[PDB]
Amino acid sequence: GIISLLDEDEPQLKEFALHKLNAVVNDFWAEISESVDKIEVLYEDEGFRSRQFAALVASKVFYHLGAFEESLNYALGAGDLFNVNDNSEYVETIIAKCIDHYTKQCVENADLPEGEKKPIDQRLEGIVNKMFQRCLDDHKYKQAIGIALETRRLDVFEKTILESNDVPGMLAYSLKLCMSLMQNKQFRNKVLRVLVKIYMNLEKPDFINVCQCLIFLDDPQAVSDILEKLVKEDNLLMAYQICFDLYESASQQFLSSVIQNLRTDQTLKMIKILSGEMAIELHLQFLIRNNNTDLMILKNTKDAVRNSVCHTATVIANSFMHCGTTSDQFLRDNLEWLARATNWAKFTATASLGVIHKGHEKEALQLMATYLPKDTSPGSAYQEGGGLYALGLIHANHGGDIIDYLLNQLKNASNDIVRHGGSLGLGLAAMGTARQDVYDLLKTNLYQDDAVTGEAAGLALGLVMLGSKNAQAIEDMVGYAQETQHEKILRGLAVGIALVMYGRMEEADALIESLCRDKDPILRRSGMYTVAMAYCGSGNNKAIRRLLHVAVSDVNDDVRRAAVESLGFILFRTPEQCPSVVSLLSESYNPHVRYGAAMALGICCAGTGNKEAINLLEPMTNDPVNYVRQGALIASALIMIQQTEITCPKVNQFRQLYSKVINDKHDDVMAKFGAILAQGILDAGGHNVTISLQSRTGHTHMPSVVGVLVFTQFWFWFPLSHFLSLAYTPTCVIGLNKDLKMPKVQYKSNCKPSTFAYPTAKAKKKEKNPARVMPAQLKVLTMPETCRYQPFKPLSIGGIIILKDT
Amino acid sequence: DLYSRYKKLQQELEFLEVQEEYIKDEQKNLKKEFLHAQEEVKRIQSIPLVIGQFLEAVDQNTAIVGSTTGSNYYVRILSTIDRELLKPNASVALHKHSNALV
Amino acid sequence: LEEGKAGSGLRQYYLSKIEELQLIVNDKSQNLRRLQAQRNELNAKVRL
Amino acid sequence: IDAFRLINANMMVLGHEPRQTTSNLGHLNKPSIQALIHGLNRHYYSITINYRKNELEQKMLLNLHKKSWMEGLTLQDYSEHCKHNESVVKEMLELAKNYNKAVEEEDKMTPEQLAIKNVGKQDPKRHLEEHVDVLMTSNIVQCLAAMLDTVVFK
């Protein structure tokens, strides 16, 4: 009990008291406990010059007593004599408490955002940058960028990116670390916007960082600013990369914004690159030259001739594998099967005509003249409705006057049979374009008061308004749902008001609360697709609060199924955890939860080669219920996409299991529908193309997610199986040097030919028709060393890239 | 990198934490649904139930029984009681419609 | 670094101690998954 | 209930297997409805039934039958539980405590036998829960009798 010396007046006994403290306090760490109140006499006295060290020893006894934030308060009142001396371990704890409290105080002041901010002591932030000198002097960028992410402030972080040496490109993948652990978009884009500016101030320009902000910051004026600087810079060759990343990985309105401010040689170039016509022609040539298909399986499914559910089966399966070939022999090889078609069968029959003709924007209209939507009036009229549906599947995303060609035919001929696939063609072609008149003429078209056309105008109005988050559109869609007696207009408007909101995160939760709280199961399922598309790409637990809650306590299995399917939409960025959390959830008593969860694991891990999802899907195809085996067949084809036998051993085991159950009449027709469907999935695009929901740049692909989420339930609407063609994206290595000119280039790949088998020294590839490639084989390949044409940009992924003449 | 992945390791931790409280509330509601299913199987069936002339238990979960109208049957027995009180020779009350072993 | 990489041993340890905690709580769900699936299959037995 | 529709015998020329949009069809067939019933699936076929709302009437008629297990008026029957209220509800507690003595005197024979046979015979006898519900009626005892302080005073 040395603290009893403080009762005497003169301070020299206090300095001698703390001189006793700092030495023998090892055994006295607990002795000062009860007398800390007497230490407060020195801590509260300003005329005592050693009150600093009094707060040091008071912070030591509080360090032994377990007090942390209190030790931080006395660390602030401990003056200069505190921060100077660090020995034993007093440091890691107090700097953990200091940095923690500091970064959560900065986060506290960052939500204000401005004004009224709490006072920040200069000493606690003093030991921030002062102890950060350890990170600056030791030249450790990993920890330096770590604390730079903690402080949540742009000034000291601007000093971290300004540190010496290099760090040549390290800000790029550091933002990959940021966006991976990023919470909200508030300060994210604010930190991102200055990093592309410091890359413009850097001596070596790099377009992958401005590519990262183009797909992350996503603001309309910035792309017009950077490209106006490209035209001002007179950039041609190396801007080819970022320009195609703008077309590929950015929204349509983003393209409309950059072309709007730009147009106010290269003038025709920006038209060619933003329209993406050259990408369609090279994709067409890639699909016709490199097509690998097997007709034997199509014949074994042909001669089955089962009268139930097989109508859409074979045509949608071979329309997948053959997409974009334009060479179709199908109506020639199978005939009596197509003569069996009736009712919606001829819809899907002529709808596949557009799935296999996907792309080929020019001749797609006149080449179908034989299969054109007649309208010869021995009424098949679902026929002539599906013909315009086929023209809508090709004209999705960008388009042309054919959109008005379908619009006039919507105002002509009959009703409502034209609106079924016709308005779907009108809305799908205007998807993401924020078309105006379509919202009006679809309101007077919505008032024609029929049922099957309900899903027609609902999906159309939801596609044209995608990303617009409008007001009167959802107001009129929710206002028409009362007086109508149809449940298909409820489901079409369900996905309609779900599709209008995409990537809204918490902005849509105001409406999500009303949709989920309502007692209408169809409107609850509407809020499930709405909260899915709004939270797509984010793993935030605010969605899983109500999304998973209605997945628990609800009494309707269908909306519960759509609730557990959203795990594939929102969590697709982190597919690995889904098999673990949904493990038991596929053991549930009702097949609906086992089904939607099987679809969740299928679409989430589809872009990965994870064997765990295939392990959990093994008992799913063994379940006694039919459609849960069916969804197990479709999802198992989604996990194996483009993946051959060398990837997972279950490829051929499931391939033979598909033809087995469809050639076996004893099995259910429902469950066997997903078999031939799985043959179309796995073989889609002649194995050359697949579905990709996540681009390498880090931005989600809107038409693929929109394609698969409308493809979720094919039972209610059979033509929804055709919408999955939009989800198909080409995977290829394009050796185009520039413009129209096509160089001849072959480069080497280090993988064995067993990986190259698509049912060593160097690989043989185009030379751009490009050549197909596996995402796992893109890292092992190397640019040609001795060839005349060598890429200026480092080659990593596939697609179309610059090739420089050397 | 170290602080990076350190800030990456609480994502799945909190995700598994919200899965904890989830599956707890899940199997809490499904438990009450199983208690409701227990109210079903205990309500099932009758009241009034025709008793019948029992002969032997042939194998697991099933057995052969004559009714009080004297006809041997083959029925999967009531699940919760397989054996102990069934015995070789007794008189078992048979389901109204099905004549199930109960 | 003491800020730091030696400090990251304590930082990552907090998420390691909560990892073991959450792991212990993860098993608390795992065996009740076996019991949930137990009475769920028994719910398939009363449906059977 | 049930559903039936007579298929046309004049359709023997064409095929007997529609429809399209199999959603409600494949879901209607299940359970497959026995044999003798689906023996009528030849020459007949069922049809789907859904309940349309009309939510206000469905909600009030929902509470109409809920008067059984909730209370008659939502007031009377559990104010009738305030009428009896342990009355004469301890008589059934005496029979419940006779179920305490009865069931738990053979419940104390169970764990010793578990040590003899080593161990579980699967089992448990159940012989579980039970009087916990009697203690839930004790929650009716403590609550409704605590209402007396509100009833008696003002």
Portion of residues in beta strands of chain A equals: under 5%
Distance linking N and C termini of chain D: 55 Å
Give a count of the beta strands of chain D, DSSP E runs of length 2 or more.
2
What's the number of extended β-strand segments of chain A?
7
Sheet with most strands of chain A: 3 strands, mixed
Strand order of the largest sheet of chain A: 4-3-6
Distance between the termini of chain A: 83 Å
User: Looking across the biggest beta sheet of chain D, what order are the strands in?
Assistant: 1-2
By secondary-structure content and strand pairing, the structural class of chain D works out as mainly alpha
Query: Please, what is the oligomeric state?
Result: part of a larger assembly
Number of helices of chain D: 6
Q: Compute the gyration radius of chain D: what is it?
A: 28 Å
Number of helices of chain A: 41
Note the beta-strand portion of chain D: under 5%
Would you kindly provide a brief summary of this structure?
The PDB classes it as hydrolase. Chain B has 102 residues and is an alpha+beta fold. Chain B is 39% helix and 24% strand.
Task: Write structural notes for this entry.
The PDB classes it as hydrolase. The structure is cut from a larger assembly and holds chains A (806 residues), B (102 residues), C (48 residues) and D (154 residues). With 806 residues, chain A is mainly alpha-helical. Helices cover 55% and strands 2% of the residues of chain A. In chain A, the strands form three sheets. Chain A has a three-stranded mixed beta sheet, with no helix packed on it. Chain A has a two-stranded antiparallel sheet with strand order 1-2. In chain A, strands 5-7 form a two-stranded antiparallel ribbon. In chain A, α26 runs antiparallel to α27 and α27 packs parallel to α29. The radius of gyration of chain A is 32 Å and the shape is elongated. A four-stranded antiparallel beta sheet of chain B has the order 3-2-1-4, with no helix packed on it. The longest helix of chain B has 33 residues. Chain D has a two-stranded antiparallel ribbon with strand order 1-2. In chain D, 1% of the residues are buried. The chains are: A mainly alpha (806), B alpha+beta (102), C mainly alpha (48), D mainly alpha (154). The interface between B and C is medium-sized, with 22 and 22 residues.
